[PDB]
Design a protein around this ligand. Structure first.
Ligand SMILES: CC[C@@H]1C(=O)N(C)c2cnc(-n3ccnc3-c3cscn3)nc2N1C1CCCC1
Length: 285
C-alpha cells in the first residue's frame, strides 16, 4: 500500500494497523524519504461531512502542529488525498499508560515519580504556549521504546480564554471533570491540575477519586471535591493529591509548586525505568 500526497508527490508506505481512535483508523505510516515510521490517524472524509466535526480535526491539527517538546507527542505532517485525512505522529512503541496500569494494577512510588515528572514537564510547555489539554488521562500518556512519556491526543485542546471571555459549556466528554467546569465557569489551567490529581491517585491506587461516568448524579460529589483517602498511601503522596484536588481552582498548586513537593524531593527516583515495569514490579530502592 503506497500513499502519495497529491500536493507534493511525497510517497509513504502504510504498515500494520495500530488500533481505533474515534474517527481515526490507525496504521503505521513509513515516510519513504526520511525512512522512518510514524503512527498515523487515517480519517475518511465520509466520517467528517458535518461542519463541526470537520472543524474539530482542523483545530486539532492547527494547535498540535506548532508544539515542539520532549514530552509532547511530536506532530510530523498532515495531508489529504481523495478520500482520507492523514495525521502522522511520534511512534510510541510501548503504547500508553492506560495499558501499563491494566497490566500492573498499581505502581510503586518511584514509578509514579518517574512518570509524573515527565507529565508536568510536557504540561508546563503547553501552559506557557497557552494551550489547555482538557483531556489528561492515563490513556493519553504515550510511552516510547526507551521509556519516555509523551503527552498526546490534542483535540479537546484549546487556547486559554480569560474568565470573562471563556467558553462555559462542557467541552466534549473528558475523563476527569473539574468542580469549576461543573459550575459553568469554563476550563482553566487549574482544571488540568485537577486531572493530574485524578491521574496521580489512579497511578497509586488503580481507581479514580471520583466516578468517571460524567452522569449528572456524579456532579454533586465532585464539587464538593470530597472523597475517601485510603490509609495505604504514604503521608507526602496523600498531601499532594489533596493539594491538586482543592475544591477552589486558585487553591491548587502551580506546576513549579508540584515538582518541588516532598513527594518528589524526599524519595528516590530513577533516571531510567526498565521496560519490565510495563508488566512486572520493580526492585526496592
Ligand atoms: C494515532 C493516535 C495515538 C497517538 O496520538 N500517538 C502519538 C500514537 C503513537 N504511537 C502509537 N503506537 C505506536 C505503536 N503502537 C501504538 C499504540 C499506542 S496505543 C495502541 N497502539 N499509537 C498512537 N496512537 C494510538 C493509535 C490508536 C489509539 C492511539
Amino acid at each position: 500500500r503506497i500513499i502519495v500526497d497529491p500536493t507534493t508527490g511525497k510517497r509513504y508506505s502504510r504498515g500494520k494497523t495500530l488500533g481505533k481512535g474515534g474517527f481515526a483508523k490507525c496504521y503505521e505510516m513509513t515516510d519513504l524519504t526520511n525512512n522512518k515510521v510514524y503512527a498515523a490517524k487515517i480519517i475518511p472524509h465520509s466520517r467528517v461531512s458535518k461542519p463541526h466535526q470537520r472543524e474539530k480535526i482542523d483545530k486539532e491539527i492547527e494547535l498540535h502542529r506548532i508544539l515542539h517538546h520532549k514530552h509532547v507527542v511530536q506532530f510530523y505532517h498532515y495531508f489529504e488525498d481523495k478520500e482520507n485525512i492523514y495525521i502522522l505522529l511520534e511512534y510510541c512503541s510501548r503504547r500508553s499508560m492506560a495499558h501499563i496500569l491494566k497490566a500492573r494494577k498499581v505502581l510503586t512510588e518511584p514509578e509514579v515519580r518517574y512518570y509524573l515528572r515527565q507529565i508536568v514537564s510536557g504540561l508546563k510547555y503547553l501552559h506557557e504556549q497557552e494551550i489547555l489539554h482538557r483531556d489528561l488521562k492515563l490513556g493519553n500518556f504515550f510511552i516510547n521504546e526507551s521509556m519516555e512519556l509523551k503527552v498526546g491526543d490534542f483535540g479537546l485542546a484549546a487556547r486559554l480564554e480569560p474568565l470573562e471571555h471563556r467558553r462555559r459549556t462542557i467541552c466534549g466528554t473528558p475523563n476527569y471533570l473539574s468542580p469549576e467546569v461543573l459550575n459553568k465557569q469554563g476550563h482553566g489551567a487549574e482544571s488540568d491540575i485537577w486531572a493530574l490529581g485524578c491521574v496521580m491517585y489512579t497511578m497509586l491506587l488503580g481507581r479514580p477519586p471520583f466516578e468517571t461516568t460524567n452522569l449528572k448524579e456524579t456532579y454533586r460529589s465532585i464539587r464538593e471535591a470530597r472523597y475517601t483517602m485510603p490509609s495505604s498511601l504514604l503521608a507526602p503522596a496523600k498531601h499532594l493529591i489533596a493539594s491538586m484536588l482543592s475544591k477552589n481552582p486558585e487553591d491548587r498548586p502551580s506546576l513549579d509548586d508540584i515538582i518541588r513537593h516532598d513527594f518528589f524531593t524526599q524519595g528516590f527516583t530513577p533516571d531510567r525505568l526498565s521496560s519490565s515495569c510495563c508488566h512486572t514490579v520493580p526492585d526496592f530502592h
